[PDB]
Amino acid sequence: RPTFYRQELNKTIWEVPERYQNLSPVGSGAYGSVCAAFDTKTGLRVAVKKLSRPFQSIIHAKRTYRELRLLKHMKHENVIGLLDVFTPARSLEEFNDVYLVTHLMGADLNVKCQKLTDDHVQFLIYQILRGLKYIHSADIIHRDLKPSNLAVNEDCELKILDFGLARYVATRWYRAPEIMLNWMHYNQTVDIWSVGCIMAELLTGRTLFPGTDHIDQLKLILRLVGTPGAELLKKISSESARNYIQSLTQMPKMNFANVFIGANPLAVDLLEKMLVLDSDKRITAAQALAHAYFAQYHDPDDEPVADPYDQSFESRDLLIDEWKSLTYDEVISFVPPP
């Protein structure tokens, strides 16, 4: 067992191995606070997250297990990877805290100075889609993809954070309209809608759909893509969602070439394919990687998929101590990457 040391950060005690030095709070992460740290074993700058009350509720205990299982499985260059997982607990009976360690990277994609050049956008979006192809192949979706959960280093290398966890006092600028309207006729291309929103913002320097509330958000989306057509309306099972759509003014679809003036025509074409209201017609991550916009980056021989991922726990209703014991087993069996 390594030697641990205690300190107070964010009005709570952090107890970590001596290996992690100079803990500095860098704000909140998903379900916990994150500290930047120096890993003395590897010489790498890392992000250490202390999960908040991981086993103090059934929802928390199951999400703790969900997150650790996800992190232990996902092994891809454009997907955040688990460098370490630890607990100061010496036994299952004392197991109450979970800490997770990943690369820090340095910044996220989220005040703005300027637009990004076309090659910079190609590289960033390519990396996002390459990471999404991998995540989606494990039957995992982000569901809350946005600039703040895209971690980038000084060389513009990118890793997706906080996927597989999500399922009106906040802006939902990158959310697919089908998740917002609870249709709930949706698939993995909800993340492709978010990619489209991000790409558009990187190219123009402006938020594509900066809705002031849930109502205004949909209004801005429909102003660009047009109101749902007859083919799409037929596929909506929800009476509540269908009623909402009809109550809105009929908007024509805008030609994106007139919205993204001066942009690479191939970027405009890809945006048209990503920002389709009908999720059955929206481009997939794998299809988007093959689009001519990424000709300089695309390599079909190096866009890997995930190994089969056992997610059967998702259907289970277990007690807090059962989720805790399963999580503990995962912590003790963890093998760090080379």
Binding site listing for ATP = 26-34, 49
In the annotation, is 162 catalytic? yes
100 part of the interface to ligand 1M8, by CB under 6 A: yes
Q: What does residue 5 show for φ and ψ, rounded to 5 degrees?
A: -135, 145
276 part of the interface to ligand 1M8, by CB under 6 A: no
26 part of the interface to ligand 1M8, by CB under 6 A: yes
Question: Which is catalytic among the residues 39, 97, 144, 162?
Answer: 162
105 part of the interface to ligand 1M8, by CB under 6 A: yes
Tell me, residue by residue from 119 to 158, as one string, x for binding to ligand 1M8 by CB under 6 A and - for no binding: --------------------------------x-------
Give the nearest distance from C-beta 49 to ligand 1M8 in angstroms: 4
164 part of the interface to ligand 1M8, by CB under 6 A: yes
Stretch that binds ligand 1M8, among 13-21, 163-171, 204-212, 240-248 (CB under 6 A): 163-171
Residue 118 has a CB neighbour count (10 Å cut-off) of 16
Pairwise CA distance, residues 164 & 141, whole Å: 5
Amino acid type, 69: R
162 part of the interface to ligand 1M8, by CB under 6 A: yes
DSSP string computed for 188-227 = TTHHHHHHHHHHHHHHHSS-S---SSHHHHHHHHHHHH-S
Tell me, residue by residue from 49 to 88, as one string, x for binding to ligand 1M8 by CB under 6 A and - for no binding: x-----------------x--xx--------x--------
Tell me how long the chain is. Answer: 338
Task: Name the token pair of 292.
Answer: 């001519």
Residues taking part in catalysis:
162
Could you list the residues that contact ligand 1M8 (CB under 6 A)?
A: 26, 29-30, 34, 47, 49, 67, 70-71, 80, 100, 102, 104-105, 107-108, 151, 161-165
